[PDB]
Amino acid sequence: TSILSIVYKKDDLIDLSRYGAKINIGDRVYYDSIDKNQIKLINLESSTIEVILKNAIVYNSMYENFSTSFWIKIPKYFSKINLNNEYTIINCIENNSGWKVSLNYGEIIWTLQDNKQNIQRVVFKYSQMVNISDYINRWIFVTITNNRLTKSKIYINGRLIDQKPISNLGNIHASNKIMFKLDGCRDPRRYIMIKYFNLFDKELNEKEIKDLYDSQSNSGILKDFWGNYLQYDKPYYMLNLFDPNKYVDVNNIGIRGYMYLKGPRGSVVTTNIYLNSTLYEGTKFIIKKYASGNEDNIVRNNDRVYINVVVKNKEYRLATNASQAGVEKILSALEIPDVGNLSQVVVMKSKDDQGIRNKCKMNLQDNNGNDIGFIGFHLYDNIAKLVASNWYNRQVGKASRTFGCSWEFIPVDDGWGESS
Amino acid sequence: YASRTKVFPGERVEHVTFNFTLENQIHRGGQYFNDKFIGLRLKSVSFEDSLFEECYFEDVTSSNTFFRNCTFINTVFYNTDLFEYKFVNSRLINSTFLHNKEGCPLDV
Ligand SMILES: *[C@@H]1O[C@H](CO[C@@H]2O[C@@H](C)[C@@H](O)[C@@H](O)[C@@H]2O)[C@@H](O[C@@H]2O[C@H](CO)[C@@H](O)[C@H](O)[C@H]2NC(C)=O)[C@H](O)[C@H]1NC(C)=O
Ligand SMILES: *[C@@H]1O[C@H](CO)[C@@H](O)[C@H](O)[C@H]1NC(C)=O
Ligand SMILES: *[C@@H]1O[C@H](CO)[C@@H](O)[C@H](O)[C@H]1NC(C)=O
């Protein structure tokens, strides 16, 4: 049911569908080292991806429903130069007729234009004043459905954001060639990243789109704050979803010292452009592989690893005393050699028992393979102290809402621009 | 007290530190480039029409201190009680506030 499917291969891009669409690539198109199937397009002329379709599959009908899907990553807009600068990223418009996706300050837009130059637009709008954003500089699954008889709808991560009737529109033509380049952007240092572009000759429903989201989500591999692959030996800042205005901190080194959530988080501001909350606050959490036999530095589900802690640019270890009072017992950072037989083994957990994707959670386990439990926080005399407990596991068994067993890993990225 | 107020219209400053205490002053039209302000107390000091660029404010406590019509670029406010009501009609660009002191939301 797929007509175009741009997928990475041996130092090139090919089409999975049985149509053999011609592909040509510029000399300035880049690829991520770990996840090469994600494509970076910078604001230049040579940064071009041209895909040519077959005359038998060119959209030239008036009742033909069709859908598209892709993954997109849009860096932060830093200055006023980006305001009111609607710039195009994909065109299939010829003779002022076709379909185009474009980007504006906190906006992603679908545009359809028939032979009569009638314009229909569907928009997704995300703010940039928020404390922590789910969209800024993070991967977004954008899919777009077009039913010529009812409406045209936009889906962000599988959920409905906007819909607009298109019954008035007449015959919509499409270009034989489809476009990938930043077009109409005044900013010379603005890029995007794109991943998995798919086209379908029918209107997709909620079920099929959710299935596609889940399929392309790579639920069996851990993800960081920016939606990329989690890697070992890389320093990560830590965020708790349920308490996101505090950061992990230490007070004393060793067992007598406790790691806690200290706050509040600071701010980064640019008056009228962005007023986010600082993400580079606290103590880094390096991940060290223990038993994962995989050659890649990519972290997968159910992996058994160790976690280093960077305190005054020195690397310590997570461990807790298994034998102490209660279940919600305190974790600590200790000298690497002096761990002894303290519980240090952690299991990385992304998808649940049924395989439904959720955020990163770590399960402390002992040498005997007994679950100390999920890592989270609990308040002892007004201090939000880090604890590993099986209470989270109990609520998971009861299908209850666990509180604090969900963590988020934030590496330093150029798309955020914060000063460390 | 208001009669005794001192005024310094215009001053350009290059790389240098600034730990001191000022009382009843107005600095106007200042242009400070990459200047760090460590361990200073401000009592009724106002900066007007000033430009701070790659500045650094640390351990700053201020009473009746304002930054009006000021522009901050790539500046960092570390361990300061300079809350958002002390920047009157200012413009901050790529600026960070870290570890803000505890204080009242308004002037006391
Ligand atoms: C605001 O910052 C961003 C990011 O720059 C980083 O953060 C700054 C505070 C400072 O610490 C820099 O050294 C950091 O690199 C700027 O956007 C980037 O600017 C750099 C130029 O050094 C350029 O190489 C990148 O391509 C820019 N990225 C984008 C997407 O434009 C931005 O320019 C700063 N704002 C202003 C007004 O200059
Ligand atoms: C600040 O520095 C000056 C010299 O630059 C010095 O005279 C003064 O004593 C310093 N203040 C403190 C608190 O040390
Ligand atoms: C200070 O602001 C005034 C108006 O509020 C403006 O005319 C002036 O240019 C500003 N000063 C500088 C140095 O730009």
Side-chain angles (χ1 to χ4, degrees), chain B residues 16-46:
Chain B
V16 66
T17 65
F18 287 118
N19 76 84
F20 53 60
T21 71
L22 309 183
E23 189 162 348
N24 203 14
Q25 304 205 346
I26 292 165
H27 312 249
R28 227 190 305 272
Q31 284 206 321
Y32 314 88
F33 180 78
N34 191 357
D35 292 297
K36 54 178 51 72
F37 294 95
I38 297 88
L40 59 82
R41 298 176 186 96
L42 306 178
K43 298 296 173 202
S44 284
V45 173
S46 297

PDB file of all heavy atoms in Angstrom, chain B residues 16-46:
ATOM      1  N   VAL B  16      37.368  43.048  33.006  1.00  0.00           N
ATOM      2  CA  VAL B  16      37.792  43.427  34.349  1.00  0.00           C
ATOM      3  C   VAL B  16      36.744  42.935  35.347  1.00  0.00           C
ATOM      4  O   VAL B  16      35.600  42.775  35.007  1.00  0.00           O
ATOM      5  CB  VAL B  16      37.980  44.953  34.497  1.00  0.00           C
ATOM      6  CG1 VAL B  16      36.651  45.680  34.363  1.00  0.00           C
ATOM      7  CG2 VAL B  16      38.666  45.320  35.811  1.00  0.00           C
ATOM      8  N   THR B  17      37.120  42.688  36.605  1.00  0.00           N
ATOM      9  CA  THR B  17      36.154  42.238  37.607  1.00  0.00           C
ATOM     10  C   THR B  17      35.506  43.426  38.320  1.00  0.00           C
ATOM     11  O   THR B  17      35.842  44.570  38.032  1.00  0.00           O
ATOM     12  CB  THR B  17      36.807  41.295  38.617  1.00  0.00           C
ATOM     13  OG1 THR B  17      37.779  42.054  39.344  1.00  0.00           O
ATOM     14  CG2 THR B  17      37.430  40.084  37.947  1.00  0.00           C
ATOM     15  N   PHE B  18      34.581  43.152  39.259  1.00  0.00           N
ATOM     16  CA  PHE B  18      33.864  44.206  39.971  1.00  0.00           C
ATOM     17  C   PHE B  18      33.222  43.716  41.271  1.00  0.00           C
ATOM     18  O   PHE B  18      32.010  43.543  41.294  1.00  0.00           O
ATOM     19  CB  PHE B  18      32.688  44.725  39.131  1.00  0.00           C
ATOM     20  CG  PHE B  18      33.033  45.579  37.937  1.00  0.00           C
ATOM     21  CD1 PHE B  18      32.704  45.165  36.652  1.00  0.00           C
ATOM     22  CD2 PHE B  18      33.681  46.793  38.087  1.00  0.00           C
ATOM     23  CE1 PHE B  18      33.038  45.930  35.543  1.00  0.00           C
ATOM     24  CE2 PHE B  18      34.011  47.560  36.982  1.00  0.00           C
ATOM     25  CZ  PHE B  18      33.692  47.128  35.717  1.00  0.00           C
ATOM     26  N   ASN B  19      33.986  43.542  42.363  1.00  0.00           N
ATOM     27  CA  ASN B  19      33.382  43.247  43.666  1.00  0.00           C
ATOM     28  C   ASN B  19      33.387  44.535  44.490  1.00  0.00           C
ATOM     29  O   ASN B  19      34.460  45.059  44.795  1.00  0.00           O
ATOM     30  CB  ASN B  19      34.008  42.047  44.404  1.00  0.00           C
ATOM     31  CG  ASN B  19      35.366  42.372  45.032  1.00  0.00           C
ATOM     32  OD1 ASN B  19      35.470  42.908  46.137  1.00  0.00           O
ATOM     33  ND2 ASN B  19      36.505  42.090  44.402  1.00  0.00           N
ATOM     34  N   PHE B  20      32.191  45.053  44.819  1.00  0.00           N
ATOM     35  CA  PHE B  20      32.085  46.325  45.530  1.00  0.00           C
ATOM     36  C   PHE B  20      30.668  46.515  46.065  1.00  0.00           C
ATOM     37  O   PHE B  20      29.804  45.709  45.772  1.00  0.00           O
ATOM     38  CB  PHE B  20      32.440  47.507  44.622  1.00  0.00           C
ATOM     39  CG  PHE B  20      31.684  47.566  43.316  1.00  0.00           C
ATOM     40  CD1 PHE B  20      30.301  47.657  43.282  1.00  0.00           C
ATOM     41  CD2 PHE B  20      32.364  47.524  42.114  1.00  0.00           C
ATOM     42  CE1 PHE B  20      29.625  47.710  42.073  1.00  0.00           C
ATOM     43  CE2 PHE B  20      31.683  47.604  40.905  1.00  0.00           C
ATOM     44  CZ  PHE B  20      30.317  47.682  40.885  1.00  0.00           C
ATOM     45  N   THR B  21      30.438  47.604  46.817  1.00  0.00           N
ATOM     46  CA  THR B  21      29.100  47.984  47.251  1.00  0.00           C
ATOM     47  C   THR B  21      28.845  49.425  46.821  1.00  0.00           C
ATOM     48  O   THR B  21      29.701  50.268  47.066  1.00  0.00           O
ATOM     49  CB  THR B  21      28.923  47.791  48.758  1.00  0.00           C
ATOM     50  OG1 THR B  21      29.701  48.793  49.413  1.00  0.00           O
ATOM     51  CG2 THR B  21      29.330  46.411  49.223  1.00  0.00           C
ATOM     52  N   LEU B  22      27.685  49.690  46.197  1.00  0.00           N
ATOM     53  CA  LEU B  22      27.305  51.039  45.791  1.00  0.00           C
ATOM     54  C   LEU B  22      25.996  51.424  46.476  1.00  0.00           C
ATOM     55  O   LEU B  22      25.180  50.551  46.742  1.00  0.00           O
ATOM     56  CB  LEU B  22      27.137  51.067  44.271  1.00  0.00           C
ATOM     57  CG  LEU B  22      28.295  50.511  43.465  1.00  0.00           C
ATOM     58  CD1 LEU B  22      28.009  50.665  41.974  1.00  0.00           C
ATOM     59  CD2 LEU B  22      29.596  51.190  43.871  1.00  0.00           C
ATOM     60  N   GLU B  23      25.804  52.722  46.754  1.00  0.00           N
ATOM     61  CA  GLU B  23      24.564  53.185  47.344  1.00  0.00           C
ATOM     62  C   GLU B  23      24.153  54.480  46.660  1.00  0.00           C
ATOM     63  O   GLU B  23      24.951  55.400  46.542  1.00  0.00           O
ATOM     64  CB  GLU B  23      24.730  53.373  48.855  1.00  0.00           C
ATOM     65  CG  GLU B  23      23.425  53.655  49.580  1.00  0.00           C
ATOM     66  CD  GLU B  23      23.441  53.421  51.087  1.00  0.00           C
ATOM     67  OE1 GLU B  23      24.411  52.806  51.584  1.00  0.00           O
ATOM     68  OE2 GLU B  23      22.488  53.864  51.766  1.00  0.00           O
ATOM     69  N   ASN B  24      22.895  54.550  46.247  1.00  0.00           N
ATOM     70  CA  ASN B  24      22.312  55.770  45.722  1.00  0.00           C
ATOM     71  C   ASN B  24      23.099  56.233  44.495  1.00  0.00           C
ATOM     72  O   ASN B  24      23.703  57.309  44.488  1.00  0.00           O
ATOM     73  CB  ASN B  24      22.215  56.834  46.818  1.00  0.00           C
ATOM     74  CG  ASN B  24      21.148  57.867  46.522  1.00  0.00           C
ATOM     75  OD1 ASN B  24      20.312  57.647  45.643  1.00  0.00           O
ATOM     76  ND2 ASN B  24      21.167  58.984  47.245  1.00  0.00           N
ATOM     77  N   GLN B  25      23.059  55.425  43.429  1.00  0.00           N
ATOM     78  CA  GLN B  25      23.747  55.774  42.194  1.00  0.00           C
ATOM     79  C   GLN B  25      22.840  55.490  41.005  1.00  0.00           C
ATOM     80  O   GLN B  25      21.980  54.615  41.046  1.00  0.00           O
ATOM     81  CB  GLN B  25      25.065  55.008  42.012  1.00  0.00           C
ATOM     82  CG  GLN B  25      26.022  55.179  43.175  1.00  0.00           C
ATOM     83  CD  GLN B  25      27.459  54.969  42.782  1.00  0.00           C
ATOM     84  OE1 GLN B  25      27.754  54.452  41.710  1.00  0.00           O
ATOM     85  NE2 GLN B  25      28.377  55.378  43.645  1.00  0.00           N
ATOM     86  N   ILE B  26      23.100  56.206  39.919  1.00  0.00           N
ATOM     87  CA  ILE B  26      22.518  55.897  38.633  1.00  0.00           C
ATOM     88  C   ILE B  26      23.644  55.860  37.603  1.00  0.00           C
ATOM     89  O   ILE B  26      24.261  56.884  37.320  1.00  0.00           O
ATOM     90  CB  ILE B  26      21.433  56.925  38.267  1.00  0.00           C
ATOM     91  CG1 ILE B  26      20.221  56.790  39.182  1.00  0.00           C
ATOM     92  CG2 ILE B  26      21.048  56.800  36.807  1.00  0.00           C
ATOM     93  CD1 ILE B  26      19.295  57.974  39.104  1.00  0.00           C
ATOM     94  N   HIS B  27      23.880  54.676  37.018  1.00  0.00           N
ATOM     95  CA  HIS B  27      24.753  54.576  35.858  1.00  0.00           C
ATOM     96  C   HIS B  27      23.921  54.552  34.585  1.00  0.00           C
ATOM     97  O   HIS B  27      23.048  53.709  34.409  1.00  0.00           O
ATOM     98  CB  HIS B  27      25.647  53.341  35.954  1.00  0.00           C
ATOM     99  CG  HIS B  27      26.327  53.188  37.262  1.00  0.00           C
ATOM    100  ND1 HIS B  27      27.685  53.331  37.442  1.00  0.00           N
ATOM    101  CD2 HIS B  27      25.837  52.887  38.461  1.00  0.00           C
ATOM    102  CE1 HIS B  27      27.979  53.126  38.721  1.00  0.00           C
ATOM    103  NE2 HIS B  27      26.866  52.867  39.354  1.00  0.00           N
ATOM    104  N   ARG B  28      24.208  55.486  33.677  1.00  0.00           N
ATOM    105  CA  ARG B  28      23.423  55.614  32.459  1.00  0.00           C
ATOM    106  C   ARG B  28      24.335  55.403  31.256  1.00  0.00           C
ATOM    107  O   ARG B  28      25.517  55.781  31.288  1.00  0.00           O
ATOM    108  CB  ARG B  28      22.787  57.006  32.377  1.00  0.00           C
ATOM    109  CG  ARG B  28      21.316  56.979  32.000  1.00  0.00           C
ATOM    110  CD  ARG B  28      20.805  58.381  31.705  1.00  0.00           C
ATOM    111  NE  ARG B  28      21.049  59.304  32.807  1.00  0.00           N
ATOM    112  CZ  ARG B  28      20.231  59.492  33.838  1.00  0.00           C
ATOM    113  NH1 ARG B  28      19.087  58.830  33.950  1.00  0.00           N
ATOM    114  NH2 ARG B  28      20.566  60.360  34.777  1.00  0.00           N
ATOM    115  N   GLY B  29      23.760  54.789  30.211  1.00  0.00           N
ATOM    116  CA  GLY B  29      24.418  54.644  28.919  1.00  0.00           C
ATOM    117  C   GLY B  29      25.684  53.796  28.978  1.00  0.00           C
ATOM    118  O   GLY B  29      26.558  53.944  28.129  1.00  0.00           O
ATOM    119  N   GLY B  30      25.776  52.910  29.974  1.00  0.00           N
ATOM    120  CA  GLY B  30      26.938  52.052  30.122  1.00  0.00           C
ATOM    121  C   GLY B  30      27.057  51.047  28.981  1.00  0.00           C
ATOM    122  O   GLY B  30      26.059  50.634  28.404  1.00  0.00           O
ATOM    123  N   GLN B  31      28.295  50.660  28.673  1.00  0.00           N
ATOM    124  CA  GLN B  31      28.566  49.591  27.727  1.00  0.00           C
ATOM    125  C   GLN B  31      29.670  48.707  28.298  1.00  0.00           C
ATOM    126  O   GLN B  31      30.856  49.030  28.213  1.00  0.00           O
ATOM    127  CB  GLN B  31      28.958  50.116  26.352  1.00  0.00           C
ATOM    128  CG  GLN B  31      27.785  50.646  25.541  1.00  0.00           C
ATOM    129  CD  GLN B  31      28.057  50.557  24.059  1.00  0.00           C
ATOM    130  OE1 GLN B  31      29.173  50.798  23.601  1.00  0.00           O
ATOM    131  NE2 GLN B  31      27.037  50.207  23.286  1.00  0.00           N
ATOM    132  N   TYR B  32      29.246  47.600  28.924  1.00  0.00           N
ATOM    133  CA  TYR B  32      30.157  46.655  29.540  1.00  0.00           C
ATOM    134  C   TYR B  32      30.265  45.410  28.664  1.00  0.00           C
ATOM    135  O   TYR B  32      29.271  44.813  28.307  1.00  0.00           O
ATOM    136  CB  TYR B  32      29.677  46.308  30.936  1.00  0.00           C
ATOM    137  CG  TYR B  32      29.255  47.486  31.764  1.00  0.00           C
ATOM    138  CD1 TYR B  32      27.966  47.970  31.721  1.00  0.00           C
ATOM    139  CD2 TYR B  32      30.137  48.093  32.620  1.00  0.00           C
ATOM    140  CE1 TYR B  32      27.572  49.036  32.502  1.00  0.00           C
ATOM    141  CE2 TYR B  32      29.762  49.159  33.420  1.00  0.00           C
ATOM    142  CZ  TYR B  32      28.469  49.624  33.363  1.00  0.00           C
ATOM    143  OH  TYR B  32      28.077  50.688  34.125  1.00  0.00           O
ATOM    144  N   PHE B  33      31.487  45.048  28.287  1.00  0.00           N
ATOM    145  CA  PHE B  33      31.717  43.900  27.427  1.00  0.00           C
ATOM    146  C   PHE B  33      32.548  42.874  28.195  1.00  0.00           C
ATOM    147  O   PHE B  33      33.686  43.131  28.569  1.00  0.00           O
ATOM    148  CB  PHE B  33      32.424  44.317  26.136  1.00  0.00           C
ATOM    149  CG  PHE B  33      32.687  43.167  25.198  1.00  0.00           C
ATOM    150  CD1 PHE B  33      31.661  42.659  24.420  1.00  0.00           C
ATOM    151  CD2 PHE B  33      33.944  42.579  25.109  1.00  0.00           C
ATOM    152  CE1 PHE B  33      31.869  41.571  23.585  1.00  0.00           C
ATOM    153  CE2 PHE B  33      34.156  41.495  24.272  1.00  0.00           C
ATOM    154  CZ  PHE B  33      33.124  41.002  23.502  1.00  0.00           C
ATOM    155  N   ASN B  34      31.952  41.711  28.435  1.00  0.00           N
ATOM    156  CA  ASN B  34      32.619  40.600  29.105  1.00  0.00           C
ATOM    157  C   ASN B  34      33.163  41.048  30.465  1.00  0.00           C
ATOM    158  O   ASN B  34      34.355  40.959  30.728  1.00  0.00           O
ATOM    159  CB  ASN B  34      33.717  39.971  28.243  1.00  0.00           C
ATOM    160  CG  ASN B  34      34.238  38.669  28.812  1.00  0.00           C
ATOM    161  OD1 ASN B  34      33.819  38.243  29.888  1.00  0.00           O
ATOM    162  ND2 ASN B  34      35.147  38.022  28.103  1.00  0.00           N
ATOM    163  N   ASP B  35      32.256  41.507  31.323  1.00  0.00           N
ATOM    164  CA  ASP B  35      32.591  41.937  32.662  1.00  0.00           C
ATOM    165  C   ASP B  35      31.874  41.063  33.673  1.00  0.00           C
ATOM    166  O   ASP B  35      30.669  40.825  33.546  1.00  0.00           O
ATOM    167  CB  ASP B  35      32.198  43.395  32.888  1.00  0.00           C
ATOM    168  CG  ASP B  35      33.037  44.343  32.062  1.00  0.00           C
ATOM    169  OD1 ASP B  35      34.243  44.387  32.267  1.00  0.00           O
ATOM    170  OD2 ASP B  35      32.462  45.010  31.209  1.00  0.00           O
ATOM    171  N   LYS B  36      32.629  40.625  34.687  1.00  0.00           N
ATOM    172  CA  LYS B  36      32.101  39.731  35.690  1.00  0.00           C
ATOM    173  C   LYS B  36      31.892  40.478  36.996  1.00  0.00           C
ATOM    174  O   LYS B  36      32.777  41.125  37.449  1.00  0.00           O
ATOM    175  CB  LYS B  36      32.995  38.498  35.842  1.00  0.00           C
ATOM    176  CG  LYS B  36      34.457  38.724  36.118  1.00  0.00           C
ATOM    177  CD  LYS B  36      35.207  37.403  36.296  1.00  0.00           C
ATOM    178  CE  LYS B  36      34.996  36.388  35.181  1.00  0.00           C
ATOM    179  NZ  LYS B  36      35.687  36.762  33.921  1.00  0.00           N
ATOM    180  N   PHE B  37      30.719  40.319  37.591  1.00  0.00           N
ATOM    181  CA  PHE B  37      30.309  41.003  38.790  1.00  0.00           C
ATOM    182  C   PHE B  37      30.138  40.005  39.941  1.00  0.00           C
ATOM    183  O   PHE B  37      29.103  39.350  40.116  1.00  0.00           O
ATOM    184  CB  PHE B  37      28.991  41.709  38.522  1.00  0.00           C
ATOM    185  CG  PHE B  37      29.060  42.822  37.516  1.00  0.00           C
ATOM    186  CD1 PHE B  37      28.750  42.601  36.186  1.00  0.00           C
ATOM    187  CD2 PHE B  37      29.396  44.095  37.904  1.00  0.00           C
ATOM    188  CE1 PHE B  37      28.828  43.618  35.254  1.00  0.00           C
ATOM    189  CE2 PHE B  37      29.469  45.122  36.968  1.00  0.00           C
ATOM    190  CZ  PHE B  37      29.129  44.888  35.658  1.00  0.00           C
ATOM    191  N   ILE B  38      31.208  39.844  40.711  1.00  0.00           N
ATOM    192  CA  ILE B  38      31.236  38.875  41.793  1.00  0.00           C
ATOM    193  C   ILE B  38      31.194  39.622  43.113  1.00  0.00           C
ATOM    194  O   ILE B  38      32.021  40.501  43.354  1.00  0.00           O
ATOM    195  CB  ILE B  38      32.482  37.974  41.730  1.00  0.00           C
ATOM    196  CG1 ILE B  38      32.509  37.133  40.458  1.00  0.00           C
ATOM    197  CG2 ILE B  38      32.575  37.101  42.965  1.00  0.00           C
ATOM    198  CD1 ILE B  38      33.171  37.823  39.297  1.00  0.00           C
ATOM    199  N   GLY B  39      30.233  39.243  43.963  1.00  0.00           N
ATOM    200  CA  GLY B  39      30.232  39.653  45.357  1.00  0.00           C
ATOM    201  C   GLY B  39      30.095  41.163  45.493  1.00  0.00           C
ATOM    202  O   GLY B  39      31.018  41.876  45.931  1.00  0.00           O
ATOM    203  N   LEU B  40      28.917  41.647  45.095  1.00  0.00           N
ATOM    204  CA  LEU B  40      28.619  43.062  45.171  1.00  0.00           C
ATOM    205  C   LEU B  40      27.229  43.250  45.751  1.00  0.00           C
ATOM    206  O   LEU B  40      26.348  42.440  45.518  1.00  0.00           O
ATOM    207  CB  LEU B  40      28.773  43.760  43.813  1.00  0.00           C
ATOM    208  CG  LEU B  40      27.952  43.295  42.613  1.00  0.00           C
ATOM    209  CD1 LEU B  40      26.564  43.876  42.618  1.00  0.00           C
ATOM    210  CD2 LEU B  40      28.636  43.768  41.341  1.00  0.00           C
ATOM    211  N   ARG B  41      27.086  44.320  46.534  1.00  0.00           N
ATOM    212  CA  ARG B  41      25.823  44.692  47.132  1.00  0.00           C
ATOM    213  C   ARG B  41      25.362  46.008  46.521  1.00  0.00           C
ATOM    214  O   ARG B  41      26.108  46.979  46.502  1.00  0.00           O
ATOM    215  CB  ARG B  41      25.973  44.832  48.646  1.00  0.00           C
ATOM    216  CG  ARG B  41      26.375  43.537  49.331  1.00  0.00           C
ATOM    217  CD  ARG B  41      26.622  43.643  50.818  1.00  0.00           C
ATOM    218  NE  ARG B  41      27.146  42.378  51.323  1.00  0.00           N
ATOM    219  CZ  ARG B  41      28.438  42.094  51.498  1.00  0.00           C
ATOM    220  NH1 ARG B  41      29.370  42.967  51.155  1.00  0.00           N
ATOM    221  NH2 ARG B  41      28.795  40.919  51.991  1.00  0.00           N
ATOM    222  N   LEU B  42      24.116  46.039  46.044  1.00  0.00           N
ATOM    223  CA  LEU B  42      23.546  47.242  45.469  1.00  0.00           C
ATOM    224  C   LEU B  42      22.416  47.737  46.376  1.00  0.00           C
ATOM    225  O   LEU B  42      21.486  47.001  46.689  1.00  0.00           O
ATOM    226  CB  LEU B  42      23.045  46.957  44.053  1.00  0.00           C
ATOM    227  CG  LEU B  42      24.050  46.341  43.075  1.00  0.00           C
ATOM    228  CD1 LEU B  42      23.403  46.059  41.739  1.00  0.00           C
ATOM    229  CD2 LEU B  42      25.251  47.232  42.849  1.00  0.00           C
ATOM    230  N   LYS B  43      22.499  49.011  46.796  1.00  0.00           N
ATOM    231  CA  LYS B  43      21.423  49.673  47.515  1.00  0.00           C
ATOM    232  C   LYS B  43      20.998  50.913  46.736  1.00  0.00           C
ATOM    233  O   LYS B  43      21.714  51.897  46.687  1.00  0.00           O
ATOM    234  CB  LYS B  43      21.889  50.063  48.915  1.00  0.00           C
ATOM    235  CG  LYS B  43      22.297  48.892  49.792  1.00  0.00           C
ATOM    236  CD  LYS B  43      21.174  47.910  50.135  1.00  0.00           C
ATOM    237  CE  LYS B  43      21.685  46.680  50.861  1.00  0.00           C
ATOM    238  NZ  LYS B  43      20.768  45.519  50.736  1.00  0.00           N
ATOM    239  N   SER B  44      19.834  50.842  46.106  1.00  0.00           N
ATOM    240  CA  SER B  44      19.282  51.942  45.348  1.00  0.00           C
ATOM    241  C   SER B  44      20.247  52.370  44.255  1.00  0.00           C
ATOM    242  O   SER B  44      20.573  53.541  44.124  1.00  0.00           O
ATOM    243  CB  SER B  44      18.876  53.066  46.239  1.00  0.00           C
ATOM    244  OG  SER B  44      17.662  52.791  46.937  1.00  0.00           O
ATOM    245  N   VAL B  45      20.672  51.413  43.425  1.00  0.00           N
ATOM    246  CA  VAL B  45      21.490  51.691  42.259  1.00  0.00           C
ATOM    247  C   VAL B  45      20.694  51.314  41.026  1.00  0.00           C
ATOM    248  O   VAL B  45      20.268  50.178  40.939  1.00  0.00           O
ATOM    249  CB  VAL B  45      22.776  50.873  42.303  1.00  0.00           C
ATOM    250  CG1 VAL B  45      23.574  51.021  41.016  1.00  0.00           C
ATOM    251  CG2 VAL B  45      23.592  51.189  43.547  1.00  0.00           C
ATOM    252  N   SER B  46      20.586  52.211  40.048  1.00  0.00           N
ATOM    253  CA  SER B  46      19.876  51.922  38.809  1.00  0.00           C
ATOM    254  C   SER B  46      20.819  52.008  37.617  1.00  0.00           C
ATOM    255  O   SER B  46      21.591  52.946  37.484  1.00  0.00           O
ATOM    256  CB  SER B  46      18.683  52.787  38.570  1.00  0.00           C
ATOM    257  OG  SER B  46      17.713  52.557  39.597  1.00  0.00           O
TER     258      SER B  46
END
